[model samples]
Target: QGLVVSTHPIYLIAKEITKGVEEPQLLLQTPAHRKAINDASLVIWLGKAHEAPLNKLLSNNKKAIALLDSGILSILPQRNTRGAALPNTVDTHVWLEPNNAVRIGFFIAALRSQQHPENKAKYWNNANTFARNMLQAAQAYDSNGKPYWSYHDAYQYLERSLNLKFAGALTDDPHVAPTAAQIKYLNDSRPKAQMCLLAESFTKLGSITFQPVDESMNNEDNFVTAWKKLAIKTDKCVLN
Candidate 1:
């Protein structure tokens, strides 16, 4: 309920998932709703250098292995015509896009393989399958020519991945309570002409359920809501 984990943009994955469906169940929450930090088996994180609470949360959970940002911070400088000293390489939210999701899947597989060698084959097999599916989906949508838009200033990783052209961000900080003008700008421009991606409940934006990738939660179904939302949007925006 304090600082947002990221000030950058996020892809409107849900918007894409709801395309072919009627009504979809929406589950979103803040970290405060998480199980005791110690009980977590895995943690999916959107990397943001300035967010200390997240850092603190991870630290408190010694077993917590996070999926760091898309490493956008390292690559931002390359995107600018006149690069600034402020490292674009600092981007932490890479999973907002589809291609990066492939990478993330592999990373997770490798980690689990090492952590549980007995299941290495299963992990690699699943990882490969997931990566292929994600790439196929992401590339298909990107090929259709949609502009990549962001709610906040971040998510350059998403823009870079989709090869999407976009407008300068409507707000420098998407986490801040937006003004009427900013909302109007977003609704009108919808920059990427892709979709409207919102942030977490901490900032009071809305409920964003990031279902966890770990399989342990499958039995109860509660774990799906823990990592990132699993509700698929269909052939629209890519959902990993």
Candidate 2:
């Protein structure tokens, strides 16, 4: 049974939930990997609001689960670097909050249980283990409103959930690098925030000389490992 998801953390979570019952697949949109999305028994995605331009990527008719639509996450509205709330769009980085993954794991467990009744109890049991592991492993630190800079604003859920200080993001868009004036804004804020958080796959601003805030991830790092890494990076952000 193919259980597919779009990203690393979700793939990890799905694998955790589906262990012993069936192995899950990761939809990285590779050449051979493309077939997995269409053939999948259960597909969980963050939706177009989050993934953006999803239709062309995976045109599957199979019934799928959208994490945002499922209503398990506490949806957050977008905010400006100046602290103004942007209208309409909700922040879709829900998994950055460790507990939300538990909700997602339990929800997927029930759905998977529905499909594979033979493993109903197994699914629920693994789900309980997932929840306990998530809760017990999650240890958040409070930045106490001390601001920190970012390459992009991808971690609002992580920021709110862990009570970490987020000074401001270098750019509103993750795909776009900061402008000269935007860099000026960061420079002026200065020593207040020692370092910034870099977005995965985004370009690092070369001219801006800050000790490159590296929130790097590896294939070996799991959901909680990534979460804890982000927490520590946000806390001891080095001297700019």
Candidate 3:
């Protein structure tokens, strides 16, 4: 089985694309299991400045695949500021948008075909199926009528791609708590017809109607699962 060195989000799409073919192992961040990184048949990863060191090693390797270089999707600006400001670092959270995921599915399938020709048909079939499913899901979650507030400003890709728009995000800094004034303003200024607030599970805003959105997707299956939840929350689009 050819191995894949990618984060969980990409891993989910890769997992489906490679299923029944050659199940690839995941390498979330750099400095992953050396043997896997070294021996991987194909390595897919983020190629921002922070990954420059790892990028160089993979660049020299024949089987490496950099998603940032694939040109299938647009990159967002990095939001996690505590980390080092690597030059030209873009947001690696590309999977939040279903359309990107759809593009990536076909891309991975093509890469898989190159690596393992025997499973080429299965890989392409899976990629097409996955892309279709994601597109349908994206349409269902259309955010046209209602605008919502988020605890953090993380879903720009989703907003841009899915016709979804947020009224505002409470804070850009995930670590910093929103001040009382900020919360009050959100509550006061929220859509009068329907106060829709999409917040993280950990946040608390006094009396505002909010639905908890799971920001942390630790496993391979949560990508679509999380989006489904978002669709449900935004349909009525009311806060707590």
Candidate 4:
């Protein structure tokens, strides 16, 4: 048996690998979750080592992995208040890339195998199956050179993995309104984005039509389903 302390995206990827072998726990960021996290065989989480309760939890736990350090995904650098450069930072939303999700599944399988050697073969088999299935799901969505815009930078991995063009983000901080200059840049750049992908809300740009996209993974089906929906949304984007 193994425990996986994870957030929403990593939880689903870990669940895929641990399906038949052992159930992995999702770290729900609650008082009740602390005990389960402390008791788990492995802890998978986001953010840097110095970042709070997760860091505190990881400090006590020997077997822990931070997805921010995981090499399979691309990173988005953070922007400062003046829109100036900051150190290149990991996005922490690594699971949006299907291939990266497969990589996480394999990583969990490797750790679980080490913890339980007798089920090594089973764990390896499940990891391979999960990787294959996810790869196929990724292949099913082809952007066909259609350009789109996202509300934020969360979709870099998805855009790169699917070979699609992302014109720009609506805002660096999706929760807040774009500044006058930010609005000017979007207008000046006049990106050939046919459709805008909206996960968080803001005013839709005048150039592109709006379409909804779920950046969060509600379930395993969402991995494939979200991408498929994105493909449809891009098709409807007219970039005029």
Which candidate number would show the highest lDDT if scored against the true structure?
2
Which of the two candidates, 2 or 4, achieves a greater TM-score against the reference? 2
TM-score of each: 0.50, 0.82, 0.76, 0.81
Instruction: Tell me the number of clashing residue pairs for each predicted model.
Output: 22, 2, 3, 1
Q: Which stretches of candidate 1 lie over 4 Å from their true place?
A: 1-35, 40-44, 47-51, 60-62, 69-85, 141-151, 175-240
Q: Once superposed on the true structure, which residue ranges of model 3 sit more than 4 Å away at CA?
A: 29-32, 49-62, 76-91, 141-144, 160-162, 179-189, 203-206, 219-226, 234-240
Candidate 2 least-lDDT 10 residues: 207-216
Where is model 2 more than 4 Å wrong at Cα? Answer: 29-34, 56-62, 140-143, 190-218, 238-240
Model 1 scores worst on lDDT over the 10 consecutive residues at 1-10
Among residues 3 or more apart in sequence or in different chains, the pairs in candidate 2 whose N, CA or C atoms overlap within 3 Å are: 147-167, 148-167
After TM-score superposition, the amount by which residue 222's alpha carbon in candidate 3 deviates from its true location, in angstroms, is 6.4
What is candidate 1's CA lDDT for residue 141?
38
Candidate 1, residue 75: Cα displacement in angstroms equals 5.3
Over 1-240, each residue of candidate 2 has an lDDT whose tens digit, in order, gives: 677887767877777788888887777635566677667788888776767656556434455677887778888888776446689978777787777889988988998988888998988998899888777656544334545566777777766655656666778876675787877776776645335445554343333323233332345346666666666655554323
By lDDT, the better pick of 3 and 4 is 3
lDDT tens readout by residue for model 3, 130-235:
8777777877643344466777765556666445545666775778876777777666766655566666574334445567655435632745665666556654
Can you give the lDDT of residue 138 in candidate 3? 73
User: How many clashes (backbone atoms < 3 Å, residues ≥3 apart in a chain or on different chains) does model 4 have?
Assistant: 1
Q: Candidate 4: misplaced stretches above 4 Å?
A: 49-53, 70-86, 141-144, 201-204, 219-240
Scored by CA lDDT, what does every candidate get? 0.40, 0.68, 0.67, 0.64
Instruction: Quote the lDDT for 58 in model 1.
Output: 60
